[PDB]
Design a protein around this ligand. Sequence first.
Ligand SMILES: CC(C)N(C(=O)c1ccc(Cl)cc1Cl)c1cc(-c2ccccc2)sc1C(=O)O
Length: 548
Amino acid sequence: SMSYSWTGALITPCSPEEEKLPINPLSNSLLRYHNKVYCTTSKSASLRAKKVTFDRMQVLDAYYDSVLKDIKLAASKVSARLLTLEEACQLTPPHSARSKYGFGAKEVRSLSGRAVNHIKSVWKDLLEDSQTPIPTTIMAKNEVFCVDPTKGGKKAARLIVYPDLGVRVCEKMALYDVTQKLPQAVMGASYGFQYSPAQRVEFLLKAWAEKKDPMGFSYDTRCFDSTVTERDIRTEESIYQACSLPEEARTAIHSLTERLYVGGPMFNSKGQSCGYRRCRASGVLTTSMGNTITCYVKALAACKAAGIVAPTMLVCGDDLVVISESQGTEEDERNLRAFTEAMTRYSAPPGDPPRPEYDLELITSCSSNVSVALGPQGRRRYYLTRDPTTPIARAAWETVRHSPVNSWLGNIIQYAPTIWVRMVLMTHFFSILMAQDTLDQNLNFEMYGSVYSVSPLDLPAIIERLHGLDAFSLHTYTPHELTRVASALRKLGAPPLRAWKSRARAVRASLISRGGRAAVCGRYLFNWAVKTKLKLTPLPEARLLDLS
Ligand SMILES: CC(C)N(C(=O)c1ccc(Cl)cc1Cl)c1cc(-c2ccccc2)sc1C(=O)O
């Protein structure tokens, strides 16, 4: 019932935390320098704790039972296997939090004796004990945002809850295969984490077009992880158990469910007993899959209870969008409140109350929205974009504080066709790379299921294969997109687009002078920066394929 119980001990940091940069070399233009970026820290952990701690009142109904029945039948169609200890170790990222048992990710990836033996006892313990809660560490996340004076004060840090490295590897052995198959099997096209930007755009355009009179809305659950109940989490296990699994996997899955997923004790970085959790833990293997399926079940049942007409939904964890047949504004709003009231009963109360949308460009899904622009031939071309405030705020931060994994590279790749990536991020970072003289250096970035390594000098080929040549010729963006980008730059205290356009010229010429791949990057990535455009032909793009 209560999402959390606290002892009073503080959520302590592990390393000295930095909340502001000494100098922001992106929010700078000769006579106008600013620094409105900030990073969340332990200091606001108590504030977040207060926010996520509340009573959950859950009451299900026939609409829910029905949808749950359908989902379990769909789940019975899946077969999954145990992952080999070796396979689970190999899936352990290079720097994931070390264990308190004398080893780190390095030792797990190389299968050192100490690590392997420890992992084996943890697995054996899971098979022998299905009751003893597994301890978790709770910590404040350090994430970068931009102050938004109008929308409110700085955001409190998100809280991360995760078990020891040894337990994490065992989770993969028992459930990794399931996480790669179950969501799509029960949700199909509605499973949002299966689409590339072009496919996501296509799904949305298609869903919108099939309605005679389309109406969409995004539903935002206030603190989704805190809203999922113990019942929800055991119900997730019953959905997992519907799959065809080896008895050994079933045992570990039940143990992991009763000892970890359903809840458990939390300790701060100092080892002090911090509290007890009775909701979703942010740092466990099943978080993404669990949230996605549970959000889908509740959302679909709510659609039925509210009488939403012909709903086509897209779900990304707790992020949900529903596009259906409009019944007129008056009726749509009535239907949306019924939907909300149903979601609430299912323990999925709304943060920002949902409102009907009748312009596709204004609907945000999985943090993005569809927009339109013209191709070199003058025809319309759709693409995925998003508010650039946070991506740029972080790009600025990662300019000073070099981090192992860059977010800017990821944003450039995922949003390559956007005007903000093209005029700002590409111009800025290629200028920085030439200044540091590290152009061909391979960098690591993330697309949330992996950490990739790529050389910026390979961006034109990567972008072509990912978004097509049109990514280098898009023009005539919408005023909504232009206004949003311009507003983000103001909030950030960064130079306006007209200034970046001037800068792009120099960056382009500098890249060309260097010849080679650098020249290709210049001619292709910045063809928008010169009045007399170069032609631009297909590249050796037909030589690669991505997973994420
Ligand atoms: C109207 C022309 C001059 N234009 C472009 O050619 C252009 C297209 C794509 C990219 Cl990535 C960059 C540029 Cl400069 C455009 C200039 C714009 C602009 C420039 C400075 C401030 C605000 C908007 S918006 C815009 C467009 O085609 O949509």
